[PDB]
Design a protein around this ligand. Structure first.
Ligand SMILES: CCc1ccccc1-c1ccc(CNCCc2nc3c(OC)cccc3[nH]2)cc1Cl
Ligand SMILES: CCc1ccccc1-c1ccc(CNCCc2nc3c(OC)cccc3[nH]2)cc1Cl
Lengths: 324, 326
């Protein structure tokens, strides 16, 4: 395959000392979990359980994420990334790294986030709300991208919102990675519905632009009230669902531009598909969230070619955000 | 008999944890194959151990290998359980593996690599800031292990490794460490002579984490006054006399009366009568650049006969002497 590099923040890690991006060499100091009392279970991941807790030393609520130790380098990577991004705009704030004296299970302690119900907001959300929160996610992305990191798991489950205080946090940095130009990354990241075409066609030299595809999948689901927007039933079928919207002509132009070899599993399922107009997805239920600006912005995110997608900084200057 | 005593901090941390945590005699040790490590050179010694620099052949990473002279089986079990309990704690030497050479079958412990700076010729370069910085780092290690219900019981310069280039410090040799249980009577034949607390010298067995804070105070006094060691005893009885020549004998009697301690008759002809000295008496041209009112107030609050009156590691961390550190 033809090599590729990010259009923005290409060399941000190249120009930094090894200690910043060398997570395997980073030394983790695990404090005593005795300072925290677990209150209740909040959420759950495939390799984590998230609890609400109280810090007994200051009577402040915190969030404790207990990690299922499956891979050691993976825990070190998330911690390093969290330490590098600690305090960044709309990034979940790592407050402590602790282990329970008896269990010795890795646990991460974060700033408390007061989650407003996802299904309660969904119908009462306005056109303004979507632009407001889209801009807040973009602040988090432009920032982590500038810090040489790609989240690689951008989805609604990984965005916590406290609608009362108009506060948003991008969470679960467990799949996050450091961007290095020319590096070949594992394509088994993100959650099926949010996987970029680069992942589905096994193109490893991807970059920050992967997060912009995932962001486009989120916006499409919100403005059209269609969740998920691209409803694949497996990773191969996922590309077919994308192809039913973007068409198969542009998919072949994409794979030819990067000299990508299409997996034979696609042979009997891909078919032939016309490129659809974004206006076809507008209906009575969703028309109050759709505008020419929203559709133009969406069109500029949901592109096969990872290089042709808007960067987080270009996205922030789009007319869709002129009112925020 | 003697009046009972208990720690002011972390008193019941082991009482409220299951058997599993502190019952080291019941802990099962999994000894891996030492074939993954090649010994490079001898770094140091211990009366019960030899410490080497080694290379892990599987990842080309340097490690530290401590080979234990099997004197007591429960003792190896205790050190391993404590190291596993503290594994990953701040400024604690990190146990990476537990191995046995296939032929020798000798217990060996594998740790994270620590790059020791030659403490020699660099004591003269050390600044007031460096002492405060490194003292704070040791306090992080102590508050953590005490919070985990462990007393180190051998705090001294030899057991603190410093990589000055990276400003990295590790508290090592947990071979004398013990689990703290309130009301437990411990063996007083612990620590190294110059660092032994008065509780050990007067054979007061119901001691606690505060023993480590006395040893820390001996280290601080030696560094700030450039007097190594600060309390230079020639035997364990003479050690108490050396302390008494500084702290005075009036406060020593108040200490032994508070705990109804019986003073050994061996002290009768050597203890004498000693006035309590001002810490300012130890300031000279060679060390005045390391001494300040804050340092002397902090030292005074560590070097107390009464183990209960000494600062805890958490109280020490909040002292004005540390207001200038990160
Ligand atoms: C107007 C915002 C928006 C714009 C476009 C697309 C989607 C949304 C959106 C819609 C809903 C949500 C809310 N997601 C909450 C997910 C969440 N993850 C959690 C969790 O993870 C461990 C634990 C406990 C609670 C948790 N809550 C987030 C977002 Cl970003
Ligand atoms: C005088 C005490 C003091 C007071 C305040 C601040 C610093 C010091 C100090 C000053 C120097 C050192 C250096 N200690 C070296 C310890 C060491 N232990 C080793 C070892 O043990 C087996 C093997 C090989 C090398 C080893 N090096 C440690 C310390 Cl803690």
């Amino acid at each position: 395959p033809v090599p590729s590099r990010a259009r923005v923040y290409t060399d941000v890690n190249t120009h930094r000392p090894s200690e910043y991006w060398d997570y395997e060499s980073h030394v983790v100091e695990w404090g005593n979990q005795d300072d925290y009392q677990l209150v209740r279970k909040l959420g759950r991941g495939k390799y984590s359980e998230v609890f609400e807790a109280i810090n007994i030393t200051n009577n402040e609520k915190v969030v404790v994420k207990i990690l299922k130790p499956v891979k050691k380098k993976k825990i070190k990577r998330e911690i390093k990334i969290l330490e590098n991004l600690r305090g960044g705009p709309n990034i979940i704030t790592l407050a402590d790294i602790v282990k329970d004296p008896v269990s010795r299970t890795p646990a991460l302690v974060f700033e408390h986030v007061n989650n407003t119900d996802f299904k309660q907001l969904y119908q009462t959300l306005t056109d303004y709300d979507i632009r407001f929160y889209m801009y807040e996610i973009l602040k988090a992305l432009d920032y982590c991208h500038s810090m040489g990191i790609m989240h690689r798991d951008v989805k609604p489950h990984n965005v916590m919102i406290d609608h009362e205080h108009r506060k948003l946090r991008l969470i679960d940095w467990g799949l996050a990675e450091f961007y290095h130009p020319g590096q070949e990354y594992n394509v088994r990241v993100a959650s099926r519905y949010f996987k970029g075409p680069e992942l589905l066609v096994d193109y490893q030299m991807y970059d920050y632009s992967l997060d912009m595809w995932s962001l486009g999948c989120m916006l499409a689901s919100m403005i059209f009230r269609k969740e998920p927007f691209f409803h694949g039933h497996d990773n191969y079928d996922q590309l077919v669902r994308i192809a039913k919207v973007l068409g198969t002509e542009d998919l072949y132009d994409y794979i030819d531009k990067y000299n990508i070899e299409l997996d034979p599993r696609f042979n009997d399922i891909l078919g032939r598909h016309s490129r659809k107009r974004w206006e076809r997805f507008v209906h009575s239920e969703n028309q109050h969230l759709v505008s020419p600006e929203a559709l133009d912005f969406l069109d500029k995110l949901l592109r096969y070619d990872h290089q042709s997608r808007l960067t987080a900084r270009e996205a922030m200057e789009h007319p869709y955000f002129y009112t925020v």
